[PDB]
């Protein structure tokens, strides 16, 4: 399901991530733009027997499982299917854990290169939360 | 209770087909099933795939706009749809498993397109 | 993505002797996969994850490989060991091999 800026943002807000770490509401949704369009179900595959899921793209190398990729460590000890559900809780949640690593929100390459030293605050200007 | 497919397929060229893959035993809504083709002489090309509960789909470069893939959660059948069948479309299409608790094909579905 | 040529392409042996089959990728690749077609049969998973051989591999076959290239060695060729065998890495955009013949001298 393609979310729709303020829906996501709104959810989000709810899920606590704003100013999880540092990391204002202007990033999370940010990511989510850059790296998924707001497709819930989006799916992508990568260099190495690995996919990324959902919204906010979670690798499942070192983040969760999907049962063909190797080198799975699956730190937030979910399915990655879990990841494709139209309600944003398995993301926020495996989110948290990630941007705790010590690295903030750089572990998302779409973030990285779209999002991080622009105007962030943005992607919620004029949107109700 | 098997990764079953349809039979054998005589085309006109332009149209379109489906074909099933019948997978059935296991909770199918878990794993991607994806899609190969064979061209005898040439081999294999692989198409795409598809995650049966969240409808994701991820497809090879040559084969997207070519090649959709359903999933019908209820009869646990996945189907395939080619748009716009040419001759070089002639092949067996296979449906598979490859993760690590099963990796069965199924048996190959044979396309022939001509009038 | 890459290609994957394999070498050679028809190669026989008899029962009893070593057999190795080459593909070499047109780029490094993190893994390798190999799968085996006997005419007459959809193809079977053989060795995935580079070395690990799939439910009923007989231990006879074992494959290697990094990088650029990989490679499939049967240690004694059995008769059952005459098929095709084809190489895939199965990347962003997973691509096949050739193929390698192996027909049973006499």
């Known amino acids: 399901k393609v979310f729709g800026r303020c829906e996501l943002a709104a959810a989000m807000k709810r899920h606590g991530l704003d100013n999880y770490r540092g990391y204002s509401l202007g990033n999370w949704v940010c990511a989510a733009k850059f790296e998924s369009n707001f497709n819930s179900q989006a799916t992508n595959r990568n260099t190495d027997g690995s996919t990324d899921y959902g919204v906010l793209q979670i690798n499942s190398r070192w983040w969760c499982n999907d049962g063909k990729t190797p080198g799975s460590r699956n730190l937030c000890n979910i399915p990655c299917s879990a990841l494709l559900s139209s309600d944003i809780t398995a993301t926020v949640n495996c989110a948290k854990k990630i941007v705790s690593d010590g690295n903030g929100m750089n572990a998302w390459v779409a973030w990285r290169n779209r999002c991080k030293g622009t105007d962030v605050q943005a992607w919620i200007r004029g949107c109700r939360l | 209770v098997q990764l079953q497919q349809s039979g054998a397929e005589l085309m006109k060229p332009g149209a379109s087909v489906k074909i099933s893959c019948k997978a059935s035993?296991?909770?199918?809504?878990?794993?991607?099933i994806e899609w190969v083709k064979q061209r005898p002489g040439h081999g294999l090309e692989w198409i795409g795939e598809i995650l049966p509960g969240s409808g994701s789909t991820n497809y090879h470069e040559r084969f997207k706009g070519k090649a959709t893939f359903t999933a019908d959660t209820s009869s646990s059948t996945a189907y395939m749809q080619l748009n716009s069948l040419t001759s070089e479309d002639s092949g067996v299409y296979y449906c598979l498993h490859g993760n690590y608790d099963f990796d069965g094909w199924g048996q190959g579905t044979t396309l022939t397109v001509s009038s | 993505d890459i290609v994957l040529t394999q070498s050679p392409a028809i190669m026989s042996a008899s029962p009893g002797e070593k057999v190795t089959m080459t593909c070499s990728a047109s780029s490094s690749v993190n893994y390798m996969y190999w799968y085996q077609q006997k005419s007459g049969t959809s193809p079977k998973r053989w060795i995935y994850d580079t070395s690990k051989l799939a439910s009923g591999v007989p231990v006879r076959f074992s494959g290697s490989g990094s990088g650029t290239s990989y490679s499939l060695t049967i240690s004694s060729m059995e008769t059952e060991d005459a098929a095709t065998y084809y190489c895939?890495?199965?990347?962003?955009?997973?691509?096949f091999g050739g193929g390698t013949k192996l027909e049973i001298k006499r």
């Open positions: 895939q890495q199965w990347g962003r955009n997973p691509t």
């Open positions: 035993g296991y909770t199918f809504s878990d794993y991607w």
